[PDB]
Amino acid sequence: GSLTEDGLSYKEKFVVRSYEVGSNKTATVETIANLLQEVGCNHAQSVGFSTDGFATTTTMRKLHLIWVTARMHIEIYKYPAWGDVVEIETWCQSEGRIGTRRDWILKDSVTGEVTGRATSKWVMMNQDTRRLQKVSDDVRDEYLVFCPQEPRLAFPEENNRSLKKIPKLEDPAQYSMIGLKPRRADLDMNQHVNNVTYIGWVLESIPQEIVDTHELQVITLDYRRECQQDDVVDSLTTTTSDSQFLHLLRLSGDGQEINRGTTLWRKK
Amino acid sequence: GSLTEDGLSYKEKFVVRSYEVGSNKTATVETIANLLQEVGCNHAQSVGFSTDGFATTTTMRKLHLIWVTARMHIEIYKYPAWGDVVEIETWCQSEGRIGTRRDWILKDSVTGEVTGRATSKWVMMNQDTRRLQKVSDDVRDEYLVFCPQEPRLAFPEENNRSLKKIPKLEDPAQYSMIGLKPRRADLDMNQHVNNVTYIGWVLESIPQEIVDTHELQVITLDYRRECQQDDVVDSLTTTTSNDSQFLHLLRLSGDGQEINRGTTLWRKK
Ligand SMILES: FC(F)(F)c1ccnc(N2CCNCC2)n1
Numbered sequence: 001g002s003l004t005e006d007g008l009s010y011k012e013k014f015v016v017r018s019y020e021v022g023s024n025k026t027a028t029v030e031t032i033a034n035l036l037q038e039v040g041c042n043h044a045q046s047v048g049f050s051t052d053g054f055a056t057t058t059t060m061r062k063l064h065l066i067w068v069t070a071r072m073h074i075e076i077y078k079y080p081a082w083g084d085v086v087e088i089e090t091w092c093q094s095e096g097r098i099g100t101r102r103d104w105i106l107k108d109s110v111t112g113e114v115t116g117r118a119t120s121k122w123v124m125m126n127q128d129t130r131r132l133q134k135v136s137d138d139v140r141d142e143y144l145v146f147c148p149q150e151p152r153l154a155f156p157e158e159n160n161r162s163l164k165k166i167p168k169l170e171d172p173a174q175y176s177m178i179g180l181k182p183r184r185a186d187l188d189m190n191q192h193v194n195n196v197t198y199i200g201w202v203l204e205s206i207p208q209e210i211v212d213t214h215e216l217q218v219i220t221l222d223y224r225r226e227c228q229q230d231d232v233v234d235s236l237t238t239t240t241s242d243s244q245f246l247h248l249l250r251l252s253g254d255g256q257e258i259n260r261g262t263t264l265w266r267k268k
Numbered sequence: 269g270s271l272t273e274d275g276l277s278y279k280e281k282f283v284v285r286s287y288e289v290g291s292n293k294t295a296t297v298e299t300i301a302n303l304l305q306e307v308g309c310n311h312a313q314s315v316g317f318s319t320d321g322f323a324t325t326t327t328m329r330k331l332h333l334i335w336v337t338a339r340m341h342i343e344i345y346k347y348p349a350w351g352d353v354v355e356i357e358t359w360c361q362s363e364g365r366i367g368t369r370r371d372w373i374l375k376d377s378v379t380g381e382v383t384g385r386a387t388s389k390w391v392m393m394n395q396d397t398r399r400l401q402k403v404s405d406d407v408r409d410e411y412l413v414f415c416p417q418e419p420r421l422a423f424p425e426e427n428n429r430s431l432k433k434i435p436k437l438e439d440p441a442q443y444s445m446i447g448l449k450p451r452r453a454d455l456d457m458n459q460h461v462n463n464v465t466y467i468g469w470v471l472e473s474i475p476q477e478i479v480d481t482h483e484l485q486v487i488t489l490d491y492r493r494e495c496q497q498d499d500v501v502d503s504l505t506t507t508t509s510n511d512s513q514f515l516h517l518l519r520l521s522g523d524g525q526e527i528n529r530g531t532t533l534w535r536k537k
């Protein structure tokens with residue numbers, strides 16, 4: 001992997017592994033999400049971010065601040081097959097004092113065609129109190145050194161899916177998967193549940209017949225609260241329709257919302 | 269006219285006037301460009317900018333700075349007819365240290381449909397030395413108070429026309445209109461040549477047959493240097509192409525110094 005000539009974006013090639021593919025011998029959406037996170041980490045390291053798992057700036061470390069994902073949106077046109085090489089380009093953009101964005105474009109290395117795109121919204125959080133906050137002047141200045149200053153968006157279209165408001169699923173849910181618990185493989189190097197695990201948990205309540213007869217085209221996931229190592233989650237799903245679903249992850253005990261999202265599926 | 273509910277954009281309605289229309293009884297592209305400038309001025313006044321003809325901030329007046337247009341890009345799907353009401357929404361965005369952008373959406377007031385869109389790039393300049401510069405931290409902070417912080421673009425599409433690099437027309441030009449001079453009606457309240465005058469001058473070298481048989485769809489104009497009140501301009505045009513496309517160059521009649529370059533795309537009626 002490497003920064004591009006202008007130093008404002010990063011590219012990396014990945015060979016899809018045997019254990020990374022589903023029943024149709026193509027990468028799962030979780031494999032895709034792990035690759036987006038990996039190229040994001042490799043970009044942060046190349047532009048001088050911390051190497052402790054938190055990917056923080058100098059000012060963020062002095063103020064005890066960390067980034068937390070607020071939203072992940074992924075659209076796949078073609079999932080790469082086992083053994084195929086997929087190239088991913090990523091870049092960041094500052095969004096005033098609201099937070100920052102990380103965008104990605106996925107290409108077939110052989111054909112050069114775009115096979116997918118993704119966007120993520122990140123918000124500042126004080127690491128100790130867990131309280132959200134605005135992005136300060138000093139942090140906005142650090143982002144100007146490695147981000148394009150003119151807008152560059154993976155999802156440019158006006159009123160596109162990536163910015164849609166997601167409603168809250170009302171009981172009773174059409175489908176559910178109860179008692180989901182993370183194991184050590186679900187934790188990152190800082191013992192927090194990895195963001196990709198929540199995508200897997202959302203997908204657990206989709207009926208196996210849908211997965212067998214449809215391809216996942218779009219997934220939009222909001223993040224509200226974290227699942228701890230000893231927490232238990234229930235994954236709920238209702239058809240809103242292509243097939244479209246509304247999703248909700250909540251703690252098994254008190255029913256506290258951890259995530260909400262939507263998925264759009266195309267018949268194979 | 270008024271700021272919208274969130275206070276991050278501005279809207280205004282205009283009734284197209286008799287002297288504002290061309291041969292097909294619809295607004296000229298110069299009428300459209302004047303309306304964009306007017307709604308831009310009304311937005312700046314509503315968010316606390318100076319009222320002297322230079323749309324300046326408190327920090328800009330302190331540092332003797334002004335904005336200058338670097339590029340204007342306009343795309344029209346339907347020109348409003350004489351007597352029609354056109355609604356225009358405008359907003360600004362900060363582009364880091366490079367400069368700022370002002371975007372516009374034009375709608376038919378009756379149907380609610382988008383009839384056109386425009387975007388403009390602005391660069392900081394010291395008013396005394398005329399030297400270009402980067403946008404300072406204090407100016408970027410002033411723009412955050414009245415601009416949307418998430419990107420809002422009139423031209424979102426990937427490699428869209430509004431960002432295309434424009435080449436320099438090589439002599440000899442296919443067409444030309446020589447000896448163009450501005451009169452007092454071409455000057456703004458600060459005695460500088462109005463930006464819309466340059467659009468008119470570019471269009472002067474398009475043959476009348478093209479204007480009679482085609483409608484202008486897209487115009488992209490780069491601004492490099494200003495024409496003074498006593499300067500004389502030559503307008504040059506060469507066809508580069510059902511659509512007709514042209515390359516344009518405005519230069520001073522004497523020494524041939526470039527003042528503007530641009531392109532136009534026309535569709536057969
Ligand atoms: F994205 C987000 F909404 F900002 C988000 C994601 C994940 N956690 C949070 N928290 C939990 C701790 N205290 C309130 C904020 N918030």
Ligand SMILES: FC(F)(F)c1ccnc(N2CCNCC2)n1
Nearest residue numbers: 336337338391398491492493494
């Ligand atoms: F857009 C632009 F290129 F920045 C521009 C437009 C108009 N004038 C100028 N300059 C800068 C150099 N000194 C003379 C005035 N520059």
